Swiss-Prot record, chain C:
Biological role stated in the UniProt entry: Subunit of the fusion protein that is processed upon entry into the host cell. Mediates fusion of the virion and cellular membranes by functioning as a class I viral fusion protein. Contains a viral fusion peptide that is unmasked after S2 cleavage. This cleavage can occur at the cell membrane by host TMPRSS2 or during endocytosis by host CSTL. In either case, this triggers an extensive and irreversible conformational change that leads to fusion of the viral envelope with the cellular cytoplasmic membrane, releasing viral genomic RNA into the host cell cytoplasm.
Identification of the protein by name: Spike protein S2'
Source superkingdom: Viruses
Taxonomic source organism: Severe acute respiratory syndrome coronavirus 2
Length: 98, 98, 49
C-alpha cells in the first residue's frame, strides 16, 4: 500500500487507456470547426445564404471532410483495440499459470 | 451620379430593407451577388450596408467585380477579392447622353 | 488563378497530399505493432533461454 500510495505513476498505464480515449473524442469535436474549403463550418449558414445549386457545392465539402475525420477515428480506435486485446490475452495467461 | 474616379458612398442603417423594390429600375441588365443569392436577401439581416454609386461605359461593367483588372478596376474603383455584396447596373443612355 | 478560385485548387492539393501523409502514419502504426510483438518474444526468450 505504501509503494502504491507514494508513487502516483504506479498505475500510469491504466490511466493512459482512459486518457487516450478521452482525447480521441475531444479531437473529433474540435474538428467540426474546420471548413474543408467551404465558406463556413456552419451548415445552416450556407443554406440560408446560397441557393440550392451553390449550397450543395459548399455543403459537400463539409460532408467529405467530416467523413474522413470519423474514418480516422475508427481506424485508430481499431488499432488500439488490438493492443488491448493482446494485453488481455497475457493477463488471462498469467491468471492461469501464476 | 458621381464620376467613377470619385465615386459616392451612402451609409445605410437602422431600416427595413425591401429588396423587391429595385427590380423595376430598368430592363435590369446586370445583377450579380457574391457570397449570397439575389433571392435570399429578403431573409437575411446585415450589420452595415453601403451603397457605392458611379457612371461608366457598358463595356466597363465587367470590371466591377473581384479579381478584375483594367482602367476602372485599378485606377478608379477597386473591390476586394473577399467582397460580399451585390452589383447592380443598368443602361441609362436616355438620361446620361447628349 | 484569381484568389476566389486559386484557393480552391490549393485546397485540393492540401487535402490530397495531407491524405498521403495519413496513409504513411497508418501503415507505420500497423508495422510498429508487428515489431513490438517480435520484441516481446525476444525479451521472453532472453529470460527463458
Amino acid at each position: 500500500q505504501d509503494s502504491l500510495s507514494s508513487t502516483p505513476s504506479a498505475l500510469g498505464k491504466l490511466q493512459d487507456v482512459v486518457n487516450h480515449n478521452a482525447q480521441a473524442l475531444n479531437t473529433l469535436v474540435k474538428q467540426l470547426s474546420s471548413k474543408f474549403g467551404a465558406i463556413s463550418s456552419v451548415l445552416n449558414d450556407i443554406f440560408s445564404r446560397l441557393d440550392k445549386p451553390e449550397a450543395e457545392v459548399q455543403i459537400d465539402r463539409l460532408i467529405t471532410g467530416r467523413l474522413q475525420s470519423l474514418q480516422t477515428y475508427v481506424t485508430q480506435q481499431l488499432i488500439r483495440a488490438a493492443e488491448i486485446r493482446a494485453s488481455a490475452n497475457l493477463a488471462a495467461t498469467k491468471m492461469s499459470e501464476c | 451620379f458621381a464620376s467613377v474616379y470619385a465615386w459616392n458612398r451612402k451609409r445605410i442603417s437602422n431600416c427595413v430593407a425591401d429588396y423587391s423594390v429595385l427590380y423595376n429600375l430598368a430592363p435590369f441588365f446586370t445583377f450579380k451577388c457574391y457570397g449570397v443569392s439575389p433571392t435570399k436577401l429578403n431573409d437575411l439581416c446585415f450589420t452595415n450596408v453601403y451603397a457605392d454609386s458611379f457612371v461608366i461605359r457598358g463595356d466597363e461593367v465587367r470590371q466591377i467585380a473581384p479579381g478584375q483588372t483594367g482602367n476602372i478596376a485599378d485606377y478608379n474603383y477597386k473591390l476586394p477579392d473577399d467582397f460580399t455584396g451585390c452589383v447592380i447596373a443598368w443602361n441609362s443612355n436616355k438620361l446620361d447622353s447628349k
